[PDB]
Design a protein around this ligand. Structure first.
Ligand code: A1A4O
Ligand code: FMN
Ligand code: LDA
Ligand code: ORO
Ligand code: CL
Ligand code: CL
Length: 368
């Protein structure tokens, strides 16, 4: 097809050539700019009814989203929908602006189809992002009604003395502009942050977040999800599941990047500090989805993320318990045509495996 034409040219020629000329962070910035301007190949893929999912109080035209980190500051939302994503997540956004870690802080591992990053929550801050989303608020209301929801991922400032207050501020400022919020407690690149996944600290934090969310007017009241690491102990996972059910958290995003370094990585930069993403994370993420689905009795929507680059990858996460999936790292290797690729392959596999649509496949492995 013309679809598989672009896919091949991008993956085999354009992307490796451009990536060889650019610093990884320059590549990131350039990608956000081009996306923001809508300077994109044609997304010829027409979303099928088979791909629609109803979860988190919304219709999703397709189950493939852009993960947090690509558009940290909400600059490229419309362009990301033009790429064919069924939903967009922006952030992480911190309350105050902050620079993040010194450069270089992003590393390519092409032999592993992986990235390592240590951005450290570089953010324009809540006020900037609020004004950016306000400028297109009604455009987004129509997008959401048309099955293209918006998520906002909230972080905390490096120097904050009260983490829960940083998240509360995010709920109050960006909650009214979001379909869902994410309490990101799983960056590997902010000191002490992942300790907020622990039981006592998590219950107190999430209680505060949910109280702030519940105080928003109805049409401005988002779902609240918790994004977790792939590096949790069994105890940590059980505790999260317990808290989520007790408080009525609306969903989970599973997973962030890993601080592990799986045996077999080949890239020269494998021992850089930071979170590892892409292919080496894939199965660690899938198995975290599987465990969290079981621990929550299939009653808590999961957005599955980590190492998705194909329809098989997406379907493995769906069958393990994800209602929706995200990707980021694949885009850095394949470019924009990867979105249509994943969707096309996923549709084909659903038909081959006897599923009437995505919904029927959610958690299917648990019923074998
Ligand atoms: C992890 C940081 N990081 C890295 C380095 O690790 N790369 N990277 C991306 C670069 C990208 C893209 C997507 C990316 F995620 C595109 O989709 C590319 C693109 C092609 C044609 C038209 C329109 C677009 C937007 C352009 N490129 C580069 C060649 C500039 C990115 O965020
Ligand atoms: C450069 C980079 C920056 C990221 N920044 C964030 C972030 O600000 N917030 C967050 O929740 N996740 C962040 N992530 C994690 C992704 O959202 C995702 O959970 C992870 O990369 C696994 O998906 P992937 O293998 O498809 O990239 C970032 C990932 C990368 C590669
Ligand atoms: C930073 C990426 C550089 C490559 C950009 C490729 C943009 C191609 C999309 C332009 C729109 C398509 N058109 C009308 C020319 O066929
Ligand atoms: O800003 C970052 O360093 C970052 C945040 C996050 O949640 N995950 C990640 O891999 N990087
Ligand atoms: Cl508002
Ligand atoms: Cl590390």
């Amino acid at each position: 097809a013309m679809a598989t034409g672009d896919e091949r040219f991008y993956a085999e020629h354009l992307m490796p050539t451009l990536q060889g000329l650019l610093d990884p962070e320059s590549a990131h910035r350039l990608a956000v700019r081009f996306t923001s301007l809508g300077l994109l190949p044609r997304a010829r893929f027409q979303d099928s009814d088979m791909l629609e999912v109803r979860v988190l109080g919304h219709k999703f035209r397709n189950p493939v989203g852009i993960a947090a980190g690509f558009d940290k500051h909400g600059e490229a939302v419309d362009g990301l929908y033009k790429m064919g994503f069924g939903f967009v997540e922006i952030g992480s956004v911190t309350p105050k602006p902050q620079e993040g870690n010194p450069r270089p802080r992003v590393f390519r591992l092409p032999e592993d189809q992986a990235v390592i990053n240590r951005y450290g929550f570089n953010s324009h801050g809540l006020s900037v992002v609020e004004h950016r989303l306000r400028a297109r608020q009604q455009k987004q209301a129509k997008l959401t009604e048309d099955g293209l929801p918006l998520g906002v991922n909230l972080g905390k400032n490096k120097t904050s003395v009260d983490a829960a207050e940083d998240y509360a501020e995010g709920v109050r400022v960006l909650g009214p502009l979001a379909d869902y919020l994410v309490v990101n407690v799983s960056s590997p690149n902010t000191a002490g942050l992942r300790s907020l996944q622990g039981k006592a600290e998590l219950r107190r934090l999430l209680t505060k977040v949910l109280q702030e969310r519940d105080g928003l007017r109805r049409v401005h009241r988002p779902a609240v999800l918790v994004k977790i690491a792939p590096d949790l102990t069994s105890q940590d996972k059980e505790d999260i599941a317990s808290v989520v059910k007790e408080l009525g958290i609306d969903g989970l995003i599973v997973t962030n990047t890993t601080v592990s370094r799986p045996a077999g990585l080949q890239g020269a930069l494998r021992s850089e500090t930071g979170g590892l993403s892409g292919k080496p994370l894939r199965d660690l993420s899938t198995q975290t989805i599987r465990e969290m689905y079981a621990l929550t009795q299939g009653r808590v929507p999961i957005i599955g993320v980590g190492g998705v680059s194909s329809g098989q990858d997406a379907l493995e996460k769906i069958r393990a318990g994800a209602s929706l999936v995200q990707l980021y790292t694949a885009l850095t290797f394949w470019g924009p045509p990867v979105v249509g690729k994943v969707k096309r392959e996923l549709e084909a596999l659903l038909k081959e495996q006897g599923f009437g649509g995505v919904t029927d496949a959610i958690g299917a492995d648990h019923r074998r």
